[PDB]
Amino acid sequence: FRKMAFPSGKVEGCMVQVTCGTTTLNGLWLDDVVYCPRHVICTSEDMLNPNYEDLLIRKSNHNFLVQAGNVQLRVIGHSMQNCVLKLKVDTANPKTPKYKFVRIQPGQTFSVLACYNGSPSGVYQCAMRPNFTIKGSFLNGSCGSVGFNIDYDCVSFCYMHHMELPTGVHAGTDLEGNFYGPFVDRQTAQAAGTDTTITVNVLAWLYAAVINGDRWFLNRFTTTLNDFNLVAMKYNYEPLTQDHVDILGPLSAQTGIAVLDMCASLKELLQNGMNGRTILGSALLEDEFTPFDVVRQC
């Protein structure tokens, strides 16, 4: 059991570089439109406090350099949709996959294709945090990198990377250009709210632990859903809903461990700690696998 991303090839074939002045970042090329963060229209003067409609009106198509590898694509139109810029180009992307734009919920996971100057460099899994940040791996030049899931040949893009907060966590938008979380596309210090732990994911990963032979944390205690929720809340864990319990059923049935029983084991983990021990090789409770992630991998 390891963190596992979707194969990135369908997204690699869409990554380009977008430049405006000395400002450069990554864009997503689908059919005849390139999508990228609007921040690219900022000179370093603008970055601190942009008025974007103002900066945009003062721009022309020829102010946009789009490169796809070696070839420069010519911009025939531009528009802004929230924090996303859309550049119409004269040429369709022959590698466009079947795709959708979706907005994800906290707790859900996705694969991130980190890219620099329109070149893919790495792929990994992240979760949307309850506080709407993501704990990614991103360096200068990563702006515009995207996150996605794949289902039967369809790429559902759900994230476009914008910025890193002071704490080192990451903030960005969906592909309609709306931020996840209370952030703005301005170069100013922004804090996120207090984060909480994705309880249903921890339960899923506990079930992974059992499928993979790691069982030391199971107990014979039991608990009601409400009494587990009281303890979870006390520990800044998200509450567990009946929907979450239902979604855990296939894992429960697989291992023969009732959901409320796995809740009782987790309760004890919260109250006692792991007493030096590990689960699935981790000293910490892991909350970035979903029940689907677990099922798919197991």
Ligand X SMILES: Cn1cnc(Cn2c(=O)nc(Nc3cc4cn(C)nc4cc3Cl)n(Cc3cc(F)c(F)cc3F)c2=O)n1
Look at residues 65, 17, 20, 62 and name the one whose alpha carbon lies nearest to residue 41.
20
For 44, 96, 98, 152, 160, the CA distances from 143, given in Å and listed in that order, are 15, 21, 24, 28, 8
Instruction: Figure out which of the listed residues 84, 87, 146, 185 binds ligand X, where binding follows CB under 6 A.
Output: 185
Q: Are 112 and 125 in contact (CB under 8 A)?
A: yes
The alpha carbon torsion through 260, 266, 270, 275 (nearest 10 deg) reads 150
**At CA 163, angle to CA 158 and CA 167, rounded to 5?**
115
Q: Which member of 36, 39, 42, 83 is catalytic?
A: 39
**CA atoms of 156 and 7, how far apart (whole Å):** 13
Q: Which string of x and - marks every residue 165-184 that binds ligand X (by CB under 6 A)?
A: -----x--------------
23 lies in the binding site for ligand X (CB under 6 A):
yes
Instruction: Figure out which of the listed residues 156, 212, 222, 254 binds a second copy, where binding follows CB under 8 A.
Output: 212
To the query of whether residue 162 is one of the catalytic residues in this protein, the response is no
Partner whose footprint covers residue 215, from ligand X, a second copy, none (CB < 5 to 8 Å by kind): none
| End-to-end Cα spacing for the chain | 8
The distance of closest approach from Cβ of residue 82 to a second copy in the complex, given in angstroms and rounded to an integer, is 28
39 lies in the binding site for ligand X (CB under 6 A):
yes
Partner whose footprint covers residue 267, from a second copy, ligand X, none (CB < 5 to 8 Å by kind): none
67 lies in the binding site for ligand X (CB under 6 A):
no
294 lies in the binding site for ligand X (CB under 6 A):
no
What are the tokens at 274? 């792991």
Contacts of 207 (CB under 8 A, 6+ apart): 248, 251, 252, 254, 255, 257, 262, 291, 294
Residue of minimal CB distance from ligand X? Answer: 185
Look at residues 280, 278, 272, 271 and name the one whose alpha carbon lies nearest to residue 298.
280
291 lies in the binding site for a second copy (CB under 8 A):
no
Instruction: Figure out which of the listed residues 81, 82, 96, 187 binds ligand X, where binding follows CB under 6 A.
Output: 187
Instruction: Figure out which of the listed residues 94, 213, 256, 273 binds a second copy, where binding follows CB under 8 A.
Output: 213
To the query of whether residue 244 is one of the catalytic residues in this protein, the response is no
Q: Which is nearer to ligand X, 5 or 115 (CB)?
A: 115
What residues act catalytically?
39, 143
